Amino acid sequence: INDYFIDYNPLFPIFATRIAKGLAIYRVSDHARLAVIPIRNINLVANYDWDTTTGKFLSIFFKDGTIRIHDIFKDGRLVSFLRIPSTKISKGIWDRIPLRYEPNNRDFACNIIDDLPKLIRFVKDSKRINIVPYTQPNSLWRGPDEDDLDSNEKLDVHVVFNEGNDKITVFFNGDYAVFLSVDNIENENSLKSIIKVQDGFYQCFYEDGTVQTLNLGPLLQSKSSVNLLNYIMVIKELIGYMLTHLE
Amino acid sequence: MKVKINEVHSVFAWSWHIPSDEDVCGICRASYNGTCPSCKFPGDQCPLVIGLCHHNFHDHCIYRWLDTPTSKGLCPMCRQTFQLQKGLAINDAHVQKFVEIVSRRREEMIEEGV
Amino acid sequence: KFINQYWSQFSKLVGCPEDDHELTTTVFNCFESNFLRIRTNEIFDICVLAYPDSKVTLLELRKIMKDFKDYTNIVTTFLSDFKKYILNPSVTTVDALLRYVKTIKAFLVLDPTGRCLHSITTFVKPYFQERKHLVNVLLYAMLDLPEEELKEKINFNVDMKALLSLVDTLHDSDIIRHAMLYEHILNYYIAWVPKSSYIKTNLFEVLLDLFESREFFISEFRNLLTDRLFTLLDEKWTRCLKLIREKIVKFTADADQSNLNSIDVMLWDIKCSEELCRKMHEVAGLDPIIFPKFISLLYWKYNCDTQGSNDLAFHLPIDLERELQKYSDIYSQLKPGRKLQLCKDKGKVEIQLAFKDGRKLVLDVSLEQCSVINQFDSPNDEPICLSLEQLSESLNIAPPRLTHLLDFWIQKGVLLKENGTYSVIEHSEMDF
Amino acid sequence: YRDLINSMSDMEKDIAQSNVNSHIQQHILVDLKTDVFAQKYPSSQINLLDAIKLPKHNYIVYLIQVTKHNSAQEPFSEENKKKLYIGTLKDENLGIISKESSVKIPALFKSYRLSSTRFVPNRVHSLLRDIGLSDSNYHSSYIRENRENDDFIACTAKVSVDGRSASLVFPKEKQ
Amino acid sequence: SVGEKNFKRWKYLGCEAYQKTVQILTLIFVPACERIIIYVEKLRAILQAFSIQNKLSYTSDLTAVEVLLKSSQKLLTMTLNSIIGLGRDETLFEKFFIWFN
Ligand SMILES: [Zn+2]
Ligand SMILES: [Zn+2]
Ligand SMILES: [Zn+2]
H, E, C per residue of C34-71: HHHHHHHHHHHHHHHCCCCCCHHHHHHHHHHCCCHHHH
Say which amino acid occupies B47: P
Q: Which of D126, D128, D158 is nearest to D144 (CA)?
A: D128
Interatomic CA distance for residues A181 and E97, integer angstroms: 66
CA of B58 to the centre of ligand 1 (A): 6
Interface partners of chain C (CB pairs < 8 Å, 3 or more) are A, B
Interchain pair E67, D11: CB under 8 A: yes
* Dihedrals phi, psi of D113, to nearest 5 degrees: -75, 105
Q: Are A87 and A104 in contact (CB under 8 A)?
A: no
User: What separation in Å is there between the alpha carbon of B98 and the centre of ligand 2?
Assistant: 15
Nearest residue of A to residue C158 by CA position?
Answer: A30
| Structure determined by | cryo-EM
| Chain A positions in Cβ-Cβ contact with residue D138 (cut-off 8 Å) | 1-2
How far apart are alpha carbons A218 and D23 in whole angstroms? 12
Strands (DSSP E) found in C271-359:
293-296, 338-354
Q: Tell me if A50 sits within 8 A of A16, measured CB to CB.
A: yes
Which ligand gives the minimal distance to the CA of B50? Answer: 2
Does D121 sit within 8 Å of A8, measured CB to CB?
yes
Helix (H, G, I), strand (E, B) or coil at A239: helix
Distance from C-alpha of E52 to C-alpha of C322, rounded to nearest angstrom: 111
3-state class (DSSP) for residue C293:
strand
Q: How far apart are CA A216 and CA A199, in angstroms?
A: 8
Longest dimension (CA), chain E: 76
D20 exposed, middle or buried (CB, 10 Å; 0-12, 13-18, 19+)? buried
Q: Do B41 and C342 touch (CB under 8 A)?
A: no
In 3D space, the residue among C99, C83, C93 whose CA is nearest the CA of residue C50 turns out to be C99
Q: Select from E47, E61, E83 the residue whose CB has the most chain D CBs within 10 Å, as the one to mutate to test that interface.
A: E47
Contact B82, B106 (CB under 8 A): no
**Which chain E residue has the Cα nearest residue A224?**
E46
The β-bridge relationship of strands A89-98 and D143-145 is unpaired
Ligand closest to B81 (CA) is 2
Nearest to C297 among B4, B15, B89 (CB): B15
Q: From CA C263, how far away is CA C241, in angstroms rounded?
A: 8
Provide the β-strand partners of residue D157: none
Distance CA B72, CA B85 (A): 18
**B14 and C276 in contact (C-beta within 8 Å)?**
no
Burial level of A72, CB count in 10 A (0-12/13-18/19+)? Answer: buried
Which chain residues have CB less than 5 Å from ligand 2, an ion? B 53, 55, 75, 77-78
Resolution given for this structure, in angstroms: 4.9
CB C297 within 8 A of CB C342: no
**DSSP 8-state assignment for residue A11:** S
Ligand nearest to the CA of B30: 3
Q: Does A195 touch chain D (CB under 8 A)?
A: yes
The rounded distance, in Å, linking the Cα atoms of C59 and C127 is: 30
- Tell me, in angstroms, the distance from the centre of ligand 3 to residue C384's CA: 55
> How far apart are alpha carbons D40 and C50 in whole angstroms?
51
Q: Which residues contact C213 (CB under 8 A, 6 or more apart)?
A: C255, C256
Query: First-to-last CA distance in chain B?
Result: 81
How many angstroms is it from C96 CA to the middle of ligand 2?
Answer: 60
Q: What is the 3-state secondary structure (H, E, C) of chain D?
A: CHHHHHHHHHHHHHHHHHHHHHHHHHCCEECCCECCHHHHCCCEEEEEEEEEECCCCCEEEEEEEEEECCCCCCCCCCCCCCEEEEEEEECCCCCECCCCEECCCCHHHCCCCHHHCEECCCCCHHHHHHHHHCCCCEEECCEEECCCCCEEECCCCCCCECCECCCEEECCCCC
Type of residue numbered C174: D
State whether D131 and A1 contact (CB < 8 Å). yes
Residue C114 gets the label, from left (phi > 0), alpha (psi -120 to 50) or beta, of left
In the stretch 224-243 of chain A, residues with CB closer than 8 A to chain E read 224, 227-228, 231-232, 234-235, 238-239, 241-242
Residue of C331, C352, C365 best to disrupt the B interface, most CBs of B under 10 A: C352
What are the φ/ψ torsions at residue C421 (nearest 5 degrees)?
A: -115, 140
Q: How many CB atoms lie within 10 A of CB A30?
A: 19
**Pair C234, C228: CB distance under 8 Å:** yes
- Residue B77, classed as helix, strand or coil, is coil
Q: How many angstroms separate the CA atoms of D53 and D127, rounded?
A: 21
3-state secondary structure of B10: strand
| E residues 13-42 closer than 8 Å to A (CB) | 20, 24, 27-29, 31-32, 34-36, 38-40, 42
User: How far apart, in whole angstroms, are the C-alpha atoms of residue D125 and residue A237?
Assistant: 47
Q: Which residues pair with C294 in a beta bridge?
A: B12
Q: Please give the single-letter amino acid code of residue E62.
A: L
Element (H, E) at B5: strand B2-16
Beta bridge partners of A159: A93, A170
Report the candidate in A236, A233, D12 with the shortest Cα–Cα distance to residue E71: D12
Q: Nearest by CB to B5, from C289, C356, C378: name it.
A: C289
Of D11, D12, D23, the CB nearest to E47: D23
Out of C84, C87, C90, whose CB is closest to A13?
C90
- CB of A246 within 8 Å of a chain C CB? The answer is no
A117 in contact with E, Cβ within 8 Å:
yes
Distance in angstroms (rounded) separating the CA atoms of residues C403 and A63: 56
What's the rounded Cα separation, in Å, for the pair C409 and C416? Answer: 9
Across the A:D interface, residue pairs with CB atoms under 8 Å apart total: 147
Q: Which residues contact C182 (CB under 8 A, 6 or more apart)?
A: none
User: How remote is the CA of residue B57 from the centroid of ligand 1, in Å?
Assistant: 9
- The minimal CB distance from B33 to the residues C297, C352, C367 is found for C297
